[PDB]
Amino acid sequence: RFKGDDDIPYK
Amino acid sequence: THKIKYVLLNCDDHQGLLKKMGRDISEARPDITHQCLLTLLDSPINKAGKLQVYIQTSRGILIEVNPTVRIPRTFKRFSGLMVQLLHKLSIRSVNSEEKLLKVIKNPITDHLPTKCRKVTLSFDAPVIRVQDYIEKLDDDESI
Amino acid sequence: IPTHAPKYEENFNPKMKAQLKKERKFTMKEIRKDAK
Amino acid sequence: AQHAVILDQEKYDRILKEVPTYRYVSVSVLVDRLKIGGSLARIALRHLEKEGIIKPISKHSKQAIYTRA
Amino acid sequence: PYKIFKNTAFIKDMFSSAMEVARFEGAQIKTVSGIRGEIKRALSKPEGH
Amino acid sequence: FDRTAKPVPVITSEVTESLEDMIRRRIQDSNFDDLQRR
Amino acid sequence: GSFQHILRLLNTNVDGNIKIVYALTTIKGVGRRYSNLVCKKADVDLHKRAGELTQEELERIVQIMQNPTHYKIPAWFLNTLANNVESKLRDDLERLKKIR
Amino acid sequence: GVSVRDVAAQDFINAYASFLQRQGKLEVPGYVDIVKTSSGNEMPPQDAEGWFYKRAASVARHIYMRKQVGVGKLNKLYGGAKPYKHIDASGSINRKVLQALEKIGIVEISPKGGRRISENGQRDLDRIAAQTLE
Amino acid sequence: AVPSVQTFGKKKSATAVAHVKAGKGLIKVNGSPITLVEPEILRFKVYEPLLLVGLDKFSNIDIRVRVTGGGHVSQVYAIRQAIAKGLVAYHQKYVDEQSKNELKKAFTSYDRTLLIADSR
Amino acid sequence: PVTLAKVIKVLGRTGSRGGVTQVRVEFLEDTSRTIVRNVKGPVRENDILVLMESEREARRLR
Amino acid sequence: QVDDEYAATSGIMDPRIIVTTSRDPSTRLSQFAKEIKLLFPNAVRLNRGNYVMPNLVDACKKSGTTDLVVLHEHRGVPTSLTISHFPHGPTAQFSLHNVVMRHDIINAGNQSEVNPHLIFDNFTTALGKRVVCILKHLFNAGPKKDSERVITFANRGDFISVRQHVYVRTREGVEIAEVGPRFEMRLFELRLGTLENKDADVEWQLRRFIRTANKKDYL
Amino acid sequence: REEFNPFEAVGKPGISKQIGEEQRKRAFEAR
Amino acid sequence: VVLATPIPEEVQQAQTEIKLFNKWSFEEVEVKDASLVDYVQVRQPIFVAHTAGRYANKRFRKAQCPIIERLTNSLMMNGRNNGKKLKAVRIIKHTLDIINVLTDQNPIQVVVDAITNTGPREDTTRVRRQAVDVSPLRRVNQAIALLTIGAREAAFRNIKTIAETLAEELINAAKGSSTSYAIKKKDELERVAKSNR
RNA sequence: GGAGCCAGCGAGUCUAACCUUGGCCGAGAGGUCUUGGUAAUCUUGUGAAACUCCGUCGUGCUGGGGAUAGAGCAUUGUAAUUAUUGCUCUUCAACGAGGAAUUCCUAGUAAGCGCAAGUCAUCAGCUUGCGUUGAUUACGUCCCUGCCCUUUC
Ligand SMILES: [Mg+2]
Ligand SMILES: [Mg+2]
Ligand SMILES: [Mg+2]
Ligand SMILES: [Mg+2]
């Protein structure tokens, strides 16, 4: 689970 | 968007191209939308599931933003999402269960709740207390 | 509320066999012109 | 959605209890209110007929309509 | 020939692929019997017909 | 390879200017071949 | 006993709520028709759902699957170049371009 | 003066098929339960037990209405769409239906071609018409 | 010979030939009773003359209808038209003309298509 | 309460917008009283129309 | 000279035309049929859904029509145009090549539907006069002298190019603007009878497999 | 003259054949 | 009555009087609103809807067509149902049966009450918008259209079929309850017209 | 999945092998032995489809969807293990009603459904014809747009 100021993963 | 590959037209990154289009590049800034959606979607009210965002593009494109979506915080990736959305008319989740961003048919009213109060932000209009207006507004209605 | 990442491509292209078929159609159209 | 696929004893009893009550009885009524599978709604309707709890008004293959006895 | 509909006919072994037929569309052709005919169009399936 | 029939005529520009010139020339004298009531 | 909401057949998770034929269809190599045939050979009532099945029925179905010929499943029933073509097309296009 | 035509088609077919399986004299080939009955069909007859007897009843009925019928016309009659181009039914099943019906004596090899309703078969069908009318 | 009349009914390509003779109220279509005509939903669409003019008129006569061409609905329309026209013709030929008058009156009052062909 | 009025004449040359017809209706309650109304669908003489308001006077809608 | 079938009616009774299409027309053919209606001043478009030719020709003949126009297409591309003159022919069939419809134009505008002036150019042979005579009588007689619309049929190697223009006379020259459509029509059948009668005698008929076909001229 | 001939209001793409043949025409001239 | 060809008992009761599907009588059905009287046609009784009558020839002939046929015709739409009038007749028969089952009152009068109630009495026309009165023929047409499309949309992706959802829509419309889809649009259109009054 | 079950336009073999009924074999595709027809005569009532009745399924990207792919059983040539057209099984994707915009349509009409012939242009799952089921809305206006007619004013 992502939270707060996380950016979506970059592949 | 415009083919150079399709790239979101930007105020600083692209100047000559928008001149060729004849559009005043001053009104060619999607970063304002990116930040506004960023500040919106990250607000606790979204985390409480009491908000829906609608985007009306200047061209006349209406976009529905599912509260579950998460735009990339980096502007460069945000542009990649927009060009993807505008051409495919929809964005699907990584898990492939729901369409987070969807283009929808105008007018806006049909999508809005049956009983809803409509207001705009006007610098010339009387200055109000946002909190006070929301309590005196009725409950079943939406803003 | 649930949070799900949006899926997208870094660069959008609007596999090779279809590309081969695509080149064929272009070749069909031109050669027909030359014959006519 | 989740509609019950099996006739349990507690599910058996309730079908007998309310099914006299409804003015209108059909496959749709059973699934909507009793959360029972469509096939089990059908087997119930042929079941409920043979004891006479419900009376048939018109029998069509797609649509079956019944009333309380 | 392998399939015949009165004047119209389908022919095989003349061309290896549809590549060739497009080049030779409308060409003058005739049978050994002397009946004249024409290359009307290339069949997509199979190649060369 | 020998061709059987007339190729379909193509309207390149020069054909267009020739036809337009013919039309303009005809209308200049009002040389119209038109049906008339009797 | 208790109805089985989920079952494990041939290393596959199968939902109990589905009819036996269309429940076995989820198995790789098993279609609607093959599922119907194996169910029939197993002498299992098709109107039953997957979870009402007794253990002997499940084992019989498994053996039917693993040994089809032994139980008379019909034989008719049971189940670089592209680069060269690309080069050829390239050569054809090159000659064509040379003509023009 | 009861007759097959005096009875509803579905009712007569069902009743006479019931009489067939109750009698148990109709020969069933081993493969009835493995076949499509047609190329266009996607799935076998759901009523695996009694579909054959129902087909036999239907064939006997059509033979009653029409004096002479062959395998081909039954194949067309029992055929349906699979664009869809009206694929014909399975010849083997109709042929075995005919052979079974003539083994019972319901039908017989018609001169001039096809099959003829046997007089014994005629009175039999009239009988089942009589009971189903009741 | 037995008194008899013959009439035709038509709609689209469907054509029905009705023979009406003296009889015992025996009505047949395609060799089968009127009660077995299909489709069932339009069964009563075949019944309009019988129920409109009363069955007692039919009880004294035999009617045989042979239908060919067109679809099921057009066949039903041809059948009903043939029954009506045959009944009217029979009362014309072998019954007094006043009865023919009431028959045509009822048929036209309900649906003119029963007597007059409606060609599209 | 909605009043009922019977059409007596269908006006022409009114310049009314397409799809709208100006008519004269006499009230069922009082025959003498007559009022000009605007109708949005197919209308003929002698038919009865429902008037939610009996006060407004019809004006050309361009 | 005006042909026998038209000599009776060539310019007293204005031609009344029905333009129609084949069964289940595509959208493009319907648009093309609309354009052909506008080309002919007295044309009325009739949707041919399940109509049958003997019924069509009979009903058309009972209504007193002079000419019937039926259009055929291939994947929304007009292919053939047949003109049949009542009460007893002739029937002329044409093949349409390089068809360009006015729907292909943005901001095109509306046509003028005045009685158009006619231009038939390079028609010399007897068959050519037949074609000109057939086409001429589709239009009204004696267009007004100042009518700004002109329809031209130009023969170039048996291929009749059809164009329409609207002209304005200027002090030093006249300027003409094409309104469209563009299409080249080649005759390939001519029969002495209505289109319904398949047994009608063939007045003229195009030989395509003849060795001189690649160079032979007819109109 | 140039303005009021849309086919050569502006025409939709692909209506004309001028570009396709002119290249071949000069090519045929070269051969 | 005895005949060589046996005839059912119900058929002689039909001989007694004309009834829709040999189960419902037209004698007691009355249009409640006076204005709608001459376009909601129920006076001539019929066994079955399917009539193949010509109703598009003249402008107001449609009024003489019986209302049940109009509903059946309106029931078949959206392409996949076009041309299947037999299915429409069967669905309407089942709908009448359902309406009678839910409410003992005559389903035909229920239909009449529903079409009367749901008819928009005032609408809007572009000039901005201006409020206009609606011709009663338009009232019946829009009422039928609203009811049919509502019954359809209710059961488009629901276990409910067309017959029972149509029966529910008709019952609610006759009741005047807001649960009915078409009543919501009748009220909305009238409110919009009132705003531009 | 069974059962009921109804059209019309046409085509079809001489110095040949076309339409093919019927019998038998084959799960099917198809094979095989006969038979009628140079045709209002035989194929053919072309027992078309959609459709109707009775059953199974059941709001689940599910028994909707059939793209892609694999393995087989056959036909056609031809001498290749070459393709070709059919059938069986398995595999089972996008798609949940479609943005800005845009095209067409008034009665046997829109729309759905199939059957036949490829008869010198065009057409090969495309052209034409044939038949089956069969609607909603309007049939009034020059208000807006556009095109005309008259003033032998
Ligand atoms: Mg259509
Ligand atoms: Mg079609
Ligand atoms: Mg076509
Ligand atoms: Mg008009």
Q: What domain range includes position M150?
A: 1-197
Helices (H), I7-71: 43-46, 48-53, 55-58
Number of domains present in the structure of chain J:
1
Closest alpha carbon to E23 in C21, G91, F1: F1
Q: Where are the alpha helices (DSSP H) in K64-190?
A: 126-136
* Element of type H or E holding D32: helix D27-34
**CB-based contact (8 Å) between C6 and chain A?**
yes
Domain extent, residue I16, equals: 1-120
User: Residue K44 CA to N110 C1' — how many Å?
Assistant: 19
Token pair recorded at residue G23: 């429940």
CATH number, domain containing residue I56: 3.30.230.10
> How near does any CA of chain F get to the CA of K53, in Å?
30
**Is the Cβ atom of K107 within 7 Å of strand N at any atom?**
no
What angle, 0 to 180 degrees and rounded to 10, lies between the N-to-C axes of helices H9-23 and H119-133?
A: 110
**Rounded distance in angstroms from the CA atom of residue K83 to the C1' atom of nucleotide N109:** 24
Whether the upstream peptide bond of residue B107 has omega within 30° of 0, thus cis, is: yes
Pairwise CA distance, residues F23 & G15, whole Å: 80
SS (H, E, C) F1-38: CCECCCCCCCCCHHHHHHHHHHHHHHHHHCCCCCCCCC
Q: Number of folded domains in chain M?
A: 1
B121 assigned binding-site residue? yes
Distance of alpha carbon M140 from alpha carbon M147, whole angstroms: 11
Contact, K164 CB vs strand N, < 7 Å: no
Tell me the residue type at K27.
Answer: T
Q: Does L25 touch chain G (CB under 8 A)?
A: no
H43 in reach of chain G (CB within 8 A): yes
Which nucleotide is closest to the Cα of K147 by its C1'? N148
Q: Would you say residue D18 lies in a domain? A: yes
G-chain residues near H33 (CB < 8 A): 40
Rg (CA), chain H: 15
Count of the separate structural domains present in chain I:
1
* DSSP string computed for B63-124: EEE-TT----SSHHHHHHHHHHHHHHSEEEBSSSS-EEEEEEPSPSGGGS-SSB------TT
Both tokens of K178, joined, read 């094409």
Residue D11 counted as domain residue: yes
Radius of gyration of chain F, Cα coordinates, nearest whole angstrom = 17
In angstroms, rounded to a whole number, what is the distance separating the alpha carbons of residues M68 and I55?
27
Protein residue closest via CA to C1' of N50: M84
For chain J, the 3-state helix, strand and coil shares in percent, each to the nearest 5, are 0, 40, 60
Chain L interface residues facing chain K, Cβ-Cβ under 8 Å? 1, 4-7, 9-12, 15, 17
In a domain, D48, yes or no: yes
Distance K44 CA to ligand 3 centre (A): 22
State the amino acid at position I65 in one-letter form: V
Ligand 4 center from residue J22 Cα (angstroms): 19
| SS3 sequence of G8-73 | EECCEEEECCCEHHHHHCCCCCCCHHHHHHHHHHCCCCCCCECCCCCHHHHHHHHHHHHCCHHHCC
Token pair belonging to B14: 């692209």
Distance CA I56, CA H17 (A): 39
Distance D68 CA to ligand 1 centre (A): 48
The bridge status of strand M24-25 relative to strand J48-51 is unpaired
Query: Resolution in angstroms, to 1 decimal, for this deposition?
Result: 3.9
β-bridge pairing K17-21 and K43-45: parallel
Query: Is any Cβ of chain M less than 8 angstroms from the Cβ of I59?
Result: yes
B chain contacts of residue A7, beta-carbon cutoff 8 Å: 72-74, 77
Q: Cβ within 7 Å of strand N: which of E 26-45? A: 38, 40-41, 43-45
Ligand that comes closest to the CA of residue K76: 3
Q: Which residue of I30, I45, I52 to mutate against M (max M Cβ within 10 Å)?
A: I45
A7 touches chain B (CB under 8 A): yes
- State the nucleotide closest to D5 in CA–C1' terms: N58
CATH of the domain at D41: 1.10.10.10
DSSP-based three-state secondary structure for C1:
coil
CATH number at residue M115: 1.10.455.10
List the structure tokens of G97.
């371009």
What SS3 state is found at G90?
helix
- Cβ E48 vs Cβ E24: under 8 Å: no
Residue D15 lies in a domain: yes
Distance K44 CA to ligand 4 centre (A): 13
Instruction: Render the burial of H105-132: b for 16+ CB within 10 Å, e for the rest.
Output: ebbbebeeebbbbbeebbebbbebbeeb
Determined by cryo-EM
Find the domain containing D69 and state its range: 7-69
CB contact set of G87 (below 8 Å; sequence gap of 6+): none
Ligand of minimum distance to the alpha carbon of K50: 1
Q: Which of K136, K152, K208 sits opposite F5 (nearest CB)?
A: K208
The sign of the CA dihedral J45, J49, J55, J56 is negative
How many Cα atoms within 13 Å fall on the side-chain side of residue J54? Answer: 15
Distance (Å) from the alpha carbon of M46 to chain D's nearest alpha carbon: 20
Ligand closest to K25 (CA) is 3
Judge whether residue E5 contacts strand N, using its CB and a 7 Å cut-off: yes
- In this complex, the residue of L5, L10, L12 whose CB is nearest that of residue K178 is L5
Supply the CATH number for residue G38's domain.
Answer: 1.10.8.50
Residue of H nearest to I27 (CA): H6
Is there a contact between I3 and I94 (Cβ–Cβ < 8 Å)? yes
**CATH number of the domain within which J31 lies:** 2.40.50.140
